Amino acid sequence: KKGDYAGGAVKILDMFENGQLGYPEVTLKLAGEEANARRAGDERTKEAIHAIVKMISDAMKPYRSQPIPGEVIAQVTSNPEYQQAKAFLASPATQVRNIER
Numbered sequence: 001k002k003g004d005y006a007g008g009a010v011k012i013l014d015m016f017e018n019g020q021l022g023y024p025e026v027t028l029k030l031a032g033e034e035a036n037a038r039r040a041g042d043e044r045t046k047e048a049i050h051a052i053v054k055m056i057s058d059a060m061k062p063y064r065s066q067p068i069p070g071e072v073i074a075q076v077t078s079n080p081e082y083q084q085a086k087a088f089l090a091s092p093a094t095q096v097r098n099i100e101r
């Protein structure tokens with residue numbers, strides 16, 4: 001609910017994986033959550049979103065609005081660091097921490 005920027009990021013990430021979002025829409029939207037997290041002092045949430053934004057940006061470099069290529073979705077979602085960051089943002093502890101702030 002209110003102030004749950006981690007949860008909001010996970011919703012964006014789910015849309016990214018479904019092909020629903022394009023580039024740079026996905027990173028601009030994640031950056032928005034990341035700024036919300038920064039303003040609220042959800043420091044770990046900010047950092048997790050930042051790591052994901054970097055991964056997506058980097059994977060899009062060879063492809064420099066547009067839909068995300070299937071190859072990029074596959075590469076990113078297969079990256080263990082991405083999986084860890086998304087799970088962290090999705091985790092109860094993180095979401096509660098965000099709501100409590």
Ligand SMILES: [Cl-]
Pocket residue numbers: 041042043044045046094097098
């Ligand atoms: Cl946090």
Ligand SMILES: [Cl-]
Pocket residue numbers: 037038039041042043044046
């Ligand atoms: Cl912070």
Ligand SMILES: [Cl-]
Pocket residue numbers: 055059075076079
């Ligand atoms: Cl990747």
